[PDB]
Design a binder for these strands. Structure first.
Ligand SMILES: [Mg+2]
Length: 438
DNA sequence: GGGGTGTGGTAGC
DNA sequence: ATCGCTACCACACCCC
């Protein structure tokens, strides 16, 4: 056990935090793409008619945690057993669940206690540990297979287990759904072989958003082909409102109230006006949804296809620790902040940049929230506070940055014993050139 | 027209 | 027990 005031707390928390792994893997995938392609030209022109194949593993962690499970779990059955991947027993997040578990209405993000109660008696939840290193290797095999197929002109990494693959269709070639079925089946078979038993599903379409929706419809272990020319009431009636990219619980709730609680995108599609959309959720998001309900991508989402190198270039660097934060005094907070900056400055040296603006964010116990929340070591119910600060000369100097961060903490006025979470950000990054003379 | 800030939402498992 | 990260866009409100 390593507590927030121990020197090794940052290292142990990140080794254990799957959310860190997700983010660290994404970042490495993004930088890897930029490296492979520094000399190649990674763009899709407006000259190109293209097909989008949106690929991702079916219940990634659960699948892989099963396939590499320890001897204690040799007899458990991925097709009959409700399986979750989690650290703990009570208020531990279900990082991933197989589709047997979902049949009982369980979803990721749910706590293990909550999911235990949606099972009939006698049916027992299986809880698998995380296998991070195997998660990596299976992902490597995933992207290695996608490249070896030589059927894609651009392979965009979305996630450790998710990629958007772009096929350019010359106008001499007449695309057909038969040929698209055969590609999906090739891809699915080849990743099944290359990953020793992991299955992917594929959405296939002539827009990013319809490929995202097709993919939801393809799950589990299948594929779906739906171009703009194939749209139908049957299609839209199949999706919830928060199946739309950009629509999370907050946008959902706003949409639900403005539009008489639509229960499908088909419901949404018939009742909506562009301006009532914009009014309900916002101008840019409203437009994105409007375009989306026609099967069309917006200008912001098309950028990744036109200039992936710019969209995938890292613009900020940060850490976030909102679990395990329990400090008795201001000295321990300052030393933790210093470990934080030291960590971020290593990462910042790796990418050979300086930073010219930094931010500190914190979570403070709500005045009426219990000192110890339901989730062990959780941040609990919190107000957030943020404050940023421009540096004069861009820099990678620990002395300047750690001093300013501690100053920022101090302007925020949060007693060490009320602290429940900390973020440390480098907001603007500046390249280091061969010229360094003033 | 151009800056700026802090805040809030969303995405992957 | 339990590991509630992190990048990025958008917005609302401020300034000369
Ligand atoms: Mg959604």
């Amino acid at each position: 056990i390593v507590a927030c005031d121990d020197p090794d707390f940052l290292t142990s928390y990140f080794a254990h935090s799957r959310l860190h792994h997700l983010s660290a893997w994404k970042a490495n995938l993004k930088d890897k793409f930029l490296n492979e392609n520094i000399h190649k030209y990674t763009k899709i022109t407006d000259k190109d008619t293209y097909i989008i194949f949106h690929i991702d593993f079916d219940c990634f962690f659960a699948t892989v945690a099963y396939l590499c499970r320890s001897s204690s779990f040799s007899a458990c059955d991925f097709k009959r057993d409700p399986i979750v991947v989690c650290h703990g027993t009570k208020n531990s997040d279900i990082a991933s669940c197989n589709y047997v578990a979902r049949s009982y209405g369980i979803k990721n993000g749910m706590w293990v206690s909550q999911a235990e109660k949606m099972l009939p008696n006698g049916i027992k939840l299986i809880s698998l540990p995380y296998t991070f290193e195997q998660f990596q290797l299976k992902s490597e095999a995933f992207y290695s297979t996608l490249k070896r197929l030589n059927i894609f002109n651009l392979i965009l990494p979305i996630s450790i287990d998710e990629a958007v693959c772009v096929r350019i269709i010359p106008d001499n070639i007449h695309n057909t759904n038969t040929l698209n079925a055969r590609l999906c089946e090739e891809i699915r078979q080849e990743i099944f072989q290359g990953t020793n038993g992991c299955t992917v599903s594929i959405g296939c379409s002539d827009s990013l958003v319809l490929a995202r929706l097709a993919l939801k419809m393809a799950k589990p272990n299948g594929y779906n082909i739906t171009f703009k020319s194939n749209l139908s009431e049957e299609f839209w009636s199949s999706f919830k409102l928060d199946d739309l990219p950009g629509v999370g619980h907050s946008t959902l709730s706003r949409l639900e109230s403005t539009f008489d609680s639509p229960h499908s995108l088909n419901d949404l599609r018939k009742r909506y006006t562009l301006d009532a959309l914009k009014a309900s959720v916002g101008s840019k998001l409203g437009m994105k949804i409007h375009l989306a309900l026609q099967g069309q991508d917006d200008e912001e989402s098309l950028k990744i296809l036109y200039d992936p190198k710019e969209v995938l270039q890292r613009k900020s660097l940060s850490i976030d620790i909102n679990w395990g934060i329990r400090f008795k005094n201001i000295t321990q907070v300052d030393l933790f902040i210093e470990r934080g900056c030291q960590y971020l400055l290593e990462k910042l040296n790796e990418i050979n940049k300086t930073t010219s603006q930094i931010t500190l964010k914190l979570m403070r116990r709500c005045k009426d929230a219990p000192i110890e929340p339901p989730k062990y070591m959780g941040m609990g119910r919190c107000d957030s506070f943020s404050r940023s600060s421009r540096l004069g000369i861009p820099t990678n100097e620990f002395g300047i940055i750690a001093t300013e961060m501690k100053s920022l903490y101090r302007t925020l006025g949060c007693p060490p014993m009320e602290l429940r979470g900390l973020a440390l950000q480098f907001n603007k990054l500046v390249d280091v050139g061969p010229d360094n003379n003033q």
